[PDB]
Amino acid sequence: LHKEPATLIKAIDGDTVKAMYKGQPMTFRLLLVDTPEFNEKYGPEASAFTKKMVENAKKIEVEFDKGQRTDKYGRGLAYIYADGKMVNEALVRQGLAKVAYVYKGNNTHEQLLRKAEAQAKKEKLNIWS
Ligand SMILES: Cc1cn([C@H]2C[C@H](OP(=O)(O)O)[C@@H](COP(=O)(O)O)O2)c(=O)[nH]c1=O
Ligand SMILES: [Ca+2]
């Protein structure tokens, strides 16, 4: 996979971010994770985590997988990096997202994220507490 440029427009919630990509506004949904909704437990905390990460970065980048690049809602499906740190992995590692929606052909980082989730579960963090 390859990282491509994007510019933050707005952090929406724990697993969706609006960003400009190839000069057009896109809503991106993070691959391989599921954060709680804002009105659910840890929802506000996931939203804040993702917001801080993307807002504080000097740059964000998007990385598409090998498969589908948009979902049925027209959201971009990507791994998002904030100053080179993956948001999808960071959320899982802090127990603010579960590994989820693992579709074959768009699952390059599945094992990386499963290892993060095991660590968050061992530490009883957040969703795992
Ligand atoms: C993460 C992801 C979600 N989706 C679709 C499946 C779910 O459809 P349904 O809306 O029918 O439940 C929805 C979950 O997104 P959210 O967790 O943002 O609600 O997004 C994909 O199709 N591919 C993906 O890789
Ligand atoms: Ca969600």
Give the domain CATH number at 36.
Answer: 2.40.50.90
Q: Give the residue numbers spanning the domain of 13.
A: 1-129
Cα separations in angstroms, 74 against 26, 28, 82: 8, 9, 23
Measured on CA atoms in the order 94, 96, 99, 103, is the torsion positive or negative? negative
**Strand 24-30 vs strand 16-21: parallel, antiparallel, or unpaired?**
antiparallel
Q: How is residue 66 written in tokens?
A: 């090998």
- Residue 113: CA atoms inside 13 Å, Cβ hemisphere, count? 23
Indicate the DSSP class of residue 10.
E
Active site residue 4: no
**Strand 76-82 vs strand 24-30: parallel, antiparallel, or unpaired?**
parallel
| Candidate of 39, 64, 72, 99 to mutate for ligand 1, largest count of ligand atoms within 8 Å of Cβ | 72
**Strand 3-13 vs strand 60-63: parallel, antiparallel, or unpaired?**
antiparallel
Pocket of ligand 1 from Cβ distances under 6 Å: 29, 31, 34, 71-72, 77, 101, 103
Sequence-distant (≥ 6) Cβ neighbours of residue 10 within 8 angstroms: 17, 18
**First-to-last CA distance in the chain?**
34
**Which one of the listed residues 45, 63, 75, 110 is annotated catalytic?**
75
- Which amino acid is residue 62, in one-letter code? V
Method by which the coordinates were obtained:
X-ray
* ∠ CA 22-24-25, rounded to 5°: 125
Indicate the DSSP class of residue 128.
G
CB 60 within 8 A of CB 14: no
Distance CA 84, CA 82 (A): 5
CB 13 within 8 A of CB 37: yes
Distance CA 44, CA 6 (A): 25
CB 10 within 8 A of CB 87: no
Q: How many domains does the chain have?
A: 1
